[PDB]
């Protein structure tokens, strides 16, 4: 198997989005995914909690592998 990142993303109401991405995907592919579900970049941040960091504040051209989102992470959408 070629490295995959499974991401589970809590929506503001507390339920989940889920999607598996190739770990070599550009972080942009994750932004696009949440946007397509109704959570555009200019309205919502995407947070991780261990460590606490703002994923939307990272270089969208870097890969998931590069930015340390692999092989599993739970993220959180939060209104800006």
């Amino acid at each position: 198997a070629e490295p995959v990142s499974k991401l589970r993303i809590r929506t503001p109401s507390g339920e989940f989005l889920e999607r598996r991405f190739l770990a070599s995907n550009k972080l942009q592919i994750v932004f696009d995914f949440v946007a397509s579900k109704g959570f555009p970049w200019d309205e919502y941040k995407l947070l991780s909690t261990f460590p606490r960091r703002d994923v939307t504040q990272l270089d969208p051209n870097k890969s998931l592998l590069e930015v340390k989102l692999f092989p599993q992470e739970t993220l959180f959408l939060e209104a800006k």
Binding site: R8, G14, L47, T49, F50, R52, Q72, E73
Partner: protein, 177 residues
């Protein structure tokens, strides 16, 4: 059910783990090996329910740790204390998808003297502790917050939904008292 119960004829229990020292000093975190998480079908950042002695329970977030032995669980002093366990004791761990973003929680400092001696408890302790952290908490928890220049212990009086929830950005935090 209980750590203290078993039938004579039973398929083994992969979810009974030996308490070990934390490397991550965070109150909300427990760490397992990746193979143990695979075996238990646990996902990084999942909320879990831990059972300890004297029917104590705790909710934590589970992370993988590459130095953790398969049979062990790393947890900090606060969680150990809430579970009434010591290093080398046995706890049980199970998935807890039942946990919702809370509507409100009620907490209070267990020390009656601290508020008078320190800075604003919400601004100096609680807000920094919970903000953007999505911590699970359970009614009855005593948790230790390191803010300002001295730690303050808080007790969870009640949660809504009960008896556990995740403290979200719109969770109303009542501290009184």
């Amino acid at each position: 059910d209980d750590l203290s119960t078993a039938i004579l004829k039973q398929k083994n229990r992969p979810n009974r783990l030996i308490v070990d020292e934390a490397i991550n000093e965070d109150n909300s975190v427990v760490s397992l090996s990746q193979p143990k998480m695979d075996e238990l079908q646990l996902f990084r950042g999942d909320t879990v329910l831990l059972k300890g002695k004297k029917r104590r329970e705790a909710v934590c977030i589970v992370l993988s740790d590459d130095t953790c032995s398969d049979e062990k669980i790393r947890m900090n002093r606060v969680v150990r204390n809430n579970l009434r366990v010591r290093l080398g004791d046995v706890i049980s761990i199970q998935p807890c998808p039942d946990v919702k973003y809370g509507k409100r929680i009620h907490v209070l400092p267990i020390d009656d003297t601290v508020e008078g001696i320190t800075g604003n408890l919400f601004e100096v302790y609680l807000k920094p502790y919970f903000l953007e952290a999505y911590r699970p908490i359970r009614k009855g928890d005593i948790f230790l917050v390191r803010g300002g220049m001295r730690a303050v212990e808080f007790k969870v009086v009640e949660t809504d939904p009960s008896p556990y929830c995740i403290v979200a950005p719109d969770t109303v935090i009542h501290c009184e008292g």
